[PDB]
Amino acid sequence: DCLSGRYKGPCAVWDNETCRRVCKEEGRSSGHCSPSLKCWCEGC
Protein backbone atom coordinates (compact mmCIF):
# COMPACT_ATOMS: atom_id res chain seq x y z
CA ASP A 1 0.00 0.00 0.00
CA CYS A 2 1.19 3.63 -0.25
CA LEU A 3 0.40 7.03 1.27
CA SER A 4 -1.82 9.24 -0.85
CA GLY A 5 0.10 11.59 -3.16
CA ARG A 6 -2.88 13.88 -3.66
CA TYR A 7 -4.34 13.97 -0.07
CA LYS A 8 -2.84 16.51 2.36
CA GLY A 9 -3.44 17.58 5.98
CA PRO A 10 -3.91 15.42 9.05
CA CYS A 11 -6.40 12.55 8.81
CA ALA A 12 -8.74 12.16 11.82
CA VAL A 13 -12.17 10.51 12.37
CA TRP A 14 -13.50 13.01 9.79
CA ASP A 15 -10.97 12.31 6.99
CA ASN A 16 -11.25 8.50 6.51
CA GLU A 17 -13.93 8.74 3.80
CA THR A 18 -11.74 11.47 2.26
CA CYS A 19 -9.12 8.75 1.94
CA ARG A 20 -11.78 6.37 0.50
CA ARG A 21 -12.51 8.86 -2.26
CA VAL A 22 -8.96 10.11 -2.97
CA CYS A 23 -7.59 6.60 -3.00
CA LYS A 24 -10.46 5.49 -5.14
CA GLU A 25 -9.76 8.40 -7.49
CA GLU A 26 -6.02 7.33 -7.93
CA GLY A 27 -7.59 3.92 -8.56
CA ARG A 28 -6.83 1.89 -5.45
CA SER A 29 -9.03 -0.26 -3.14
CA SER A 30 -9.75 2.52 -0.62
CA GLY A 31 -7.94 4.92 1.67
CA HIS A 32 -7.40 3.92 5.25
CA CYS A 33 -6.59 6.53 7.85
CA SER A 34 -3.63 6.04 10.17
CA PRO A 35 -3.31 6.46 13.94
CA SER A 36 -0.64 9.05 12.98
CA LEU A 37 -3.37 11.18 11.38
CA LYS A 38 -2.19 10.14 7.93
CA CYS A 39 -3.96 8.92 4.74
CA TRP A 40 -2.97 5.65 3.16
CA CYS A 41 -4.25 4.37 -0.02
CA GLU A 42 -4.67 0.60 -0.08
CA GLY A 43 -3.98 -1.38 -3.29
CA CYS A 44 -0.40 -0.27 -3.89
From Swiss-Prot:
Major localization class: secreted
Residue positions with a glycan: 16
Induction of its expression: By bacterial infection (at protein level). In hemolymph 6 hours after bacterial infection, levels of expression increase for first 24 hours and persist for the following three weeks (at protein level). Up-regulated by septic injury caused by the Gram-positive bacterium M.luteus and the fungus C.albicans, and by M.luteus or E.faecalis-derived peptidoglycans and by B.subtilis or A.oryzae proteases. Up-regulated by Gram-negative bacteria in the respiratory epithelium.
GO terms (BP aspect): antibacterial humoral response; antifungal humoral response; antimicrobial humoral immune response mediated by antimicrobial peptide; defense response; defense response to fungus; defense response to Gram-negative bacterium; defense response to protozoan; killing of cells of another organism
Tissue expression from the record: Hemolymph (at protein level). Synthesized in the fat body and is secreted into the blood. In larvae, expressed in the visceral branches and posterior spiracles of the trachea.
Intrachain S-S bonds: 2-44, 11-33, 19-39, 23-41
CC terms in the record's Gene Ontology section: extracellular space
Subcellular localization, as worded in the UniProt entry: Secreted
The entry's keywords: Antimicrobial, Disulfide bond, Fungicide, Glycoprotein, Secreted, Signal
Domain of life the protein comes from: Eukaryota
Role of this protein: Possesses antifungal activity and is active against a relatively broad spectrum of filamentous fungi. It inhibits spore germination at high concentrations and at low concentrations delays growth of hyphae which subsequently exhibit abnormal morphology. Part of a psh-dependent Toll pathway, which may function in activating the systematic immune response in response to localized melanization of the tracheal system.
Protein name per Swiss-Prot or TrEMBL: Drosomycin
The organism of origin for this protein: Drosophila melanogaster
